[PDB]
Amino acid sequence: QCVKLNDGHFMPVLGFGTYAPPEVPRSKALEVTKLAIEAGFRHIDSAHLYNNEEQVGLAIRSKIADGSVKREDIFYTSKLWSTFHRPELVRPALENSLKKAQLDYVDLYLIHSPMSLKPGVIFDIVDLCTTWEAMEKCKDAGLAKSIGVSNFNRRQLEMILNKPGLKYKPVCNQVECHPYFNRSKLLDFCKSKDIVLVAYSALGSQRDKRWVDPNSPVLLEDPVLCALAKKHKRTPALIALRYQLQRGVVVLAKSYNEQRIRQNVQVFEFQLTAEDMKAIDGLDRNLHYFNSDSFASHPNYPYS
């Protein structure tokens, strides 16, 4: 299934997360993106920050050139990093992303975070309305088929939606979302504005020691998810993915393992009951896996 975006384009509701920590050799991003496309992934989420756009792009181009898929079948996302928020830097950043991936366009270009950074942690002060205007210019130039934001709260989304002269609403807001942090309020707000919430860390994050508290609860060990996995003869990961699909959320899933990449495409093979849905709804504990002790003082910190 795909969801119709508010600009008329369609987004597959299951996306493949490509990010890996820098101690992961860059070859792996190439090999696994190919496996993801062979497994049935069409939505691919990359970013300038990930230092993998060349490898992810080459996997997409490899699968096109061998007849597996056509460019039209692939929904490719890149993101504008926070050091490029100043409006004159936005298009060059997208163009640079296009050359690394060797693609003519991205299906979706996002503002990675509202927390602007020094162009070149050093904060910067940018009016994100001007950043969005340059976002809109890229869509009008054909370099991005759709544009959106990421890690925005409700107030930051309102800043864009109430912008005078606004030409394109953001098609999506990609935010951390999982049973332990389910974003029900923001989902309802985005739903009311025809903005698709896209969930990252839907499986509980990669728990990287540099940003995730070691003592934070492991999402996939959660007793309710494992009991539901046993009930439906699925895995705890699949229950968490299916939860987002049935609440109208487009869900990303990162795996660099061949068997788990294929497992995640079985999210379409079963359904949760309404009672199952409410049990997962009760697991929220406002848990941000991405601890931001260095960023909580940013004027645009989205969790304040």
Ligand X SMILES: CN(Cc1ccc(C(=O)O)cc1)C(=O)C1=Cc2ccc(F)cc2OC1
Say whether residue 153 binds ligand NAP (CB under 6 A).
no
Say whether residue 16 binds ligand X (CB under 6 A).
no
111 is in an annotated binding site: no
Nearer to ligand X, 207 or 232 (CB): 207
Q: How far is the CB of 211 from ligand X (least distance, A)?
A: 5
Nearer to ligand X, 47 or 135 (CB): 47
Q: How far is the CB of 261 from ligand NAP (least distance, A)?
A: 7
Q: How far is the CB of 11 from ligand NAP (least distance, A)?
A: 14
Say if strands 10-12 and 2-4 run parallel, antiparallel, or are unpaired.
Answer: antiparallel
Say whether residue 128 binds ligand NAP (CB under 6 A).
no
Say whether residue 47 binds ligand X (CB under 6 A).
yes
Say whether residue 301 binds ligand X (CB under 6 A).
no
136 Ramachandran zone, left/alpha/beta (phi>0; psi -120 to 50)? alpha
Say whether residue 300 binds ligand NAP (CB under 6 A).
no
Chain positions contacting ligand NAP, by CB under 6 A: 17-19, 45, 112-113, 150-151, 174, 200-206, 220, 235, 237, 252-257, 260, 263-264
Chain positions contacting ligand X, by CB under 6 A: 19, 47, 49, 211
